[PDB]
Amino acid sequence: PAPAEVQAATLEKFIQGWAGWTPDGFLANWSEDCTQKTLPFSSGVPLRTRADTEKLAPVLMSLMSNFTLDIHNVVHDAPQGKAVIYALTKADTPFGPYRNEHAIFLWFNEIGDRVQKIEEMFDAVVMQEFLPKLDKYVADN
Amino acid sequence: PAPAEVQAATLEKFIQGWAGWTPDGFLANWSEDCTQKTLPFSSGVPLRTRADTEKLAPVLMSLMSNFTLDIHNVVHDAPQGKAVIYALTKADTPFGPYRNEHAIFLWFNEIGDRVQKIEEMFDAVVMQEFLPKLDKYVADN
Numbered sequence: 159p160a161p162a163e164v165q166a167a168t169l170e171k172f173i174q175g176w177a178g179w180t181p182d183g184f185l186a187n188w189s190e191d192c193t194q195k196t197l198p199f200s201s202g203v204p205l206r207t208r209a210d211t212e213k214l215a216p217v218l219m220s221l222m223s224n225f226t227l228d229i230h231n232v233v234h235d236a237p238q239g240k241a242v243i244y245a246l247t248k249a250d251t252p253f254g255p256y257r258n259e260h261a262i263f264l265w266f267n268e269i270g271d272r273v274q275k276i277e278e279m280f281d282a283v284v285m286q287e288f289l290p291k292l293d294k295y296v297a298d299n
Numbered sequence: 300p301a302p303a304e305v306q307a308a309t310l311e312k313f314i315q316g317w318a319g320w321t322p323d324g325f326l327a328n329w330s331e332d333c334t335q336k337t338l339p340f341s342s343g344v345p346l347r348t349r350a351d352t353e354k355l356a357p358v359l360m361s362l363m364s365n366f367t368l369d370i371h372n373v374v375h376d377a378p379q380g381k382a383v384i385y386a387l388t389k390a391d392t393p394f395g396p397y398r399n400e401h402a403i404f405l406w407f408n409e410i411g412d413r414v415q416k417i418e419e420m421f422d423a424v425v426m427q428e429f430l431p432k433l434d435k436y437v438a439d440n
C-alpha cells in the first residue's frame with residue numbers, strides 16, 4: 159500500500175467531500191472502478207457503481223438540506239490500505255427530518271489517492287424503497 | 300498504545316474466543332471493565348457491562364448450536380489501539396436457523412492483552428427481545 163500519510167490525506171478528503179454534500183465533491187475521491195456495497199450482505203442490496211452514484215447523488219443531495227456529518231470514530235489500517243469511519247448524519251427533507259448512521263469500510267487504491275472500494279452498514283431504506291420508486295417514475299415517462 | 304504485534308495477537312485471540320463459542324473462552328479476552336454498546340446510537344440500546352455479558356453468554360451459547368464465525372474484514376489501527384472486524388455468523392436454534400452480521404469496533408487496553416471497549420452494529424433482536432422475555436419467565440416462577 160501507499161504511505162500512511164498519503165492514505166490519510168485521501169481519507170480526510172473523502173470525509174470532506176461527503177460533508178460538503180455536493181455530487182462532484184464527494185465523487186472526486188472515488189477511483190474510476192470504485193463501488194459501494196450495502197451491508198449486511200443478507201439484505202441483498204445491489205452494489206452501486208461510480209456511474210450509478212453520479213446519477214443518484216444529485217437528486218439525493220438536493221432533497222436533503224442542512225446536511226450535517228458527525229464523525230464518531232475513524233480507524234485507519236495503513237499497512238493494509240483500509241479504513242473504517244463511523245458517522246452520524248442528519249438532514250431536512252420535504253417529508254420531515256432525516257437521520258442515519260453509517261459504519262463505512264474503505265479500501266484505498268494502490269497509489270493511495272483514491273477510494274477504490276466501499277462497503278457500508280447503514281439504514282438503507284432510501285436505497286431499498288426510494289430508488290425503485292424513482293426508477294419506475296422514470297420508466298412511466 | 301501497546302505494540303502493534305501484541306494488539307494483533309489479542310485481536311486474533313478475541314476472534315478465537317468468539318469462534319470457540321464458550322462463555323469463559325469468549326469473555327477471557329475482555330478486560331475486567333470492558334463494555335459493549337449496540338449501534339446505531341439512534342436505537343438507544345443501553346450499554347452492557349462485562350457482568351451483563353457474563354449473565355447473557357451461557358444461555359445464548361447453549362441455544363445456538365453449530366455456531367460458525369466467518370471473518371470478512373479486519374481493519375487494525377495500531378497507532379490508535381483500535382480495530383474493526385466485520386463478521387458473519389450462523390447457527391441452529393430450536394426455533395429455526397440463525398444468521399447475523401456484525402461491524403464490531405474494538406479498543407485494546409494499554410497493556411495490549413485485552414479488549415476494553417466494544418461498539419457494534421448488528422441485528423440486536425436476540426439481546427433486546429429474547430433475554431428480557433426469559434427474565435420475565437423466571438420472575439413468574
Ligand SMILES: COC(=O)c1cc(C)cc(O)c1C(=O)c1c(O)cccc1O
Nearest residue numbers: 176184214215218219260262280284285
Ligand atoms: C448521496 O449520498 C451519498 O453521497 C452517500 C455517501 C456515503 C458516504 C454513504 C452513502 O450511503 C451515501 C448515499 O448514497 C446515501 C444513500 O444512498 C441513501 C441515503 C443517504 C445516503 O447518504
Ligand SMILES: COC(=O)c1cc(C)cc(O)c1C(=O)c1c(O)cccc1O
Nearest residue numbers: 317325355356359360399401421425426
Ligand atoms: C453471546 O455473546 C456473543 O458471543 C457475542 C459476541 C460478539 C463479538 C458480539 C455480540 O453481540 C455477542 C452477543 O452478545 C450476541 C447477542 O447478544 C445476540 C446474538 C448474537 C450474539 O453474538
